Amino acid sequence: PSFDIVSEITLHEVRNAVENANRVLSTRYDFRGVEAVIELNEKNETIKITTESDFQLEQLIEILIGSCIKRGIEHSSLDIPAESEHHGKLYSKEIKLKQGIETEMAKKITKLVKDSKIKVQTQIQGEQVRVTGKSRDDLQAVIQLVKSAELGQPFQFNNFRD
């Protein structure tokens, strides 16, 4: 048998979170008279945040995170750069939506499996990790293992095949 490890982001839920975050943002006493933009590029899978200083960026980030929590979206699905791009008077950050599993994260998954000694095979393909084993009880252990760890982005488990 097998199962797929996946990392999917429901954009629908994300657009919802960004709307909430713009409503909070428009009532912020400390942002009155201050440029501050929180936009979603649904085609690019990016959330662009722009304001007048790195501090204020941090402040926008807390809003964002504060909106995922309200929408029960896991914040770690956001890939937020450490540095800001400074343009004239403005500073911004392109925040990436973690849609799927890139090789780097897949290798952290595959590595964890090797280390757990569970007798299952891993195939890094597409944007997922397929876990194949003789034993369903082992496959379940794998699920608990990956759930327990903090590799860095949320995972889902589907396509259980016999």
Ligand code: MMC
């Ligand atoms: C974005 Hg929350």
Ligand SMILES: [Hg+2]
């Ligand atoms: Hg989010």
